[PDB]
């Protein structure tokens, strides 16, 4: 009942977390029973919020809706409610307030960027009773949540998947905005470069070989410490390559031992044939040979020589039998065929899409450190378009579009930030405030000449963490036809590339909209490279692949086409962060720590600051909530 509400909030239902011990020391240092009832009140208020997240849950409605034993200790109920409301576990997202937020607002803060992190932090700080204003360089809100809308056509160019609802705050936000989510059919047929389908047996054989290779690299790192070789951190690509080399030699070694057995039996047979012709000539020359007793003795010798010959002929029979049967049963010739390698490269490209970077750059030890915080349930796509979430989050917020910040000043006296209108950067704006929450993407902070100056310049640990962490890339091309020529029962289908070097080029195709739209991904080393290619020839290559799969007859020229270039986009400089070889999971927490030239005044939020949920939009949401909570807890 209430345990489900605790789980949905990413909390253990029968034990208090560390932040609750920090905010409620009188309980962790007290009796067990009051800890248990604290947990019950927390879970019950969470359940009340989650069962009807459309309207604000007040302390008053909380008190009135709790049941008999707990409704009387009003002060602890209010403590629990205030704790939960401060940290964004209740009254977050877009909800109808019971009383409109107060007129006078104690504290003014500017927020860089209008992404999901920025919008969430803005809404939290607004309903906390503070003055908030956003500066967004782009001409729309959401940032990396980009939905191309034209006529009947809807297509997400950035955020596109909801990675499960079990514990996901995106479940609450989807319920609030009435966004319809549809399951993804996890059936992905593959098609080779010529267009012929990959048979079932080969498909699943290569798939499970890929999985075994990945588990082998996991082992190499987590029980042999194959983490630093030659004073160099090991990538996932290195471990994959060396495990492939190991299995290729297992193949070669079994080949060698088979050849050695066969040649040794061949030598045995040649020498036995020598012995046999020797005995044959002995038998012949004796066959050519009291005289009655001599005849009888000669025959007594000849029969013995003949039984000798025939016993050895029996041994020869079983030995030629053995040679033939080992001529029949050899081991594998190649570990992977050429086509086997191409299919395995498709699976590698799928992993490169999952991490938005080439595995040549992923920390073998830490690339999947977030894995233990994944949500339960099935992955869901959005049909209304993911922009329905940022735009819905933006109503009622003081958002200044087309204002790119170029300088951020933070001193103990206050904070001044210099922004500039984008459409002609001669006009200049300047904003004073008490705090600044930066939600700039890591790609913007990484830029070769700093697109935003910081005065005083950022600390050593901050800039070092910015440089160590990885910020990957992943692109989409969407094709809008008039007719649907593909199988409407499959959401995913793959195209296997010819070369390993270009295995992530148009390797996956999505039919996740029942409107006639097809989405093709570009991941890995191709992502940052095919951005240098005009849209027309990329859609030409897509049409070539689709012609090879379906025939030149059944595919018309598309009626609308869109291409993403996220690394080129000056407001993104890539897709999402990844754990680079030199980096670790602690670098996200370093990105999360605020700066103080004294009290902290420059705070950081965004997808690259949430250790347990990076690379995802629910991570940006939760990071915005956390930073708003700490800002309001300091300034109020
Ligand atoms: C590019 C791409 C991003 C995502 C995805 C795909 C792409 C192509 N996937 C889809 C595939 C997938 C599947 C499964 C797992 C992972 C991925 C999405 C998905 O299936 N799930 C998912 O969950 N997150 C997906 N993701 C990740 C992101 O979607 C997510 O990580 C959030 O988008 C992070 O958002 P946030 O941290 O807020 O950063 P933004 O970039 O959103 O906000 C910053 C704002 O700053 C403005 N700005 C810039 N420079 C400025 C300046 N100088 N002055 C003022 N403003 C400035 C920008 O204009 C922007 O608006």
Residue numbers in the entry: 173 to 461, 475 to 782, 792 to 830
Paper text:
The inhibitor-bound structures were superimposed and compared with the native LSD1 structure to examine whether these inhibitors resulted in any other observable structural changes. While both inhibitors bound to the FAD domain, phenelzine but not GSK induced small structural changes in the CoREST binding region of LSD1, which has been shown to be important for LSD1's activity and stability. Phenelzine treatment abrogated co-localization of LSD1 and CoREST or SNAIL and CoREST as indicated by a strong negative PCC score in the phenelzine-treated samples. Phenelzine also reduced LSD1 nuclear enzymatic activity.
The LSD1-CoREST complex has been shown to promote demethylation of nucleosomal histone 3 lysine 4 (H3K4) and histone 3 lysine 9 (H3K9). We first confirmed whether the inhibitors act via a FAD-dependent mechanism by crystallizing LSD1 in the presence and absence of phenelzine and GSK. However, the crystals diffracted to similar resolution and belonged to the same space group, each containing one LSD1 molecule in the asymmetric unit.
